[PDB]
Symmetry: C3
Subunit: 30 residues, 3 copies
C-alpha cells in the first residue's frame, strides 16, 4: 500500500510547490 501513499506524497509535493509560488506571488503584490 506504499504505492498509494507514494502517489499521494507526490501529489502533496506538487500542491506545496504551487502554494509556494502563489504565496510568493502575493508577497510581491502586498
Amino acid at each position: 500500500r506504499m504505492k498509494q501513499l507514494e502517489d499521494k506524497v507526490e501529489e502533496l509535493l506538487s500542491k506545496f510547490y504551487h502554494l509556494e509560488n502563489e504565496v510568493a506571488r502575493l508577497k510581491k503584490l502586498v
Copy 2:
C-alpha cells in the same frame, strides 16, 4: 509506522486544501 504515515499524509492533504483557500482569499485582497 505505516498507518501513521498514511494518516499524516491525509492530515497534510487537507491542510493543503485549507491553505489553497486561504491563498485564494488573500488574492482577492492583493
Copy 3:
C-alpha cells in the same frame, strides 16, 4: 521504503508550517 516517506513528510510538514506562517503574515497586511 517507509523512511523515504517519513523524510518527505517531515519536509512537507516544514513547508506546510512555513506556508501557514506566510499566510498568517499576508493576512496581517492587506
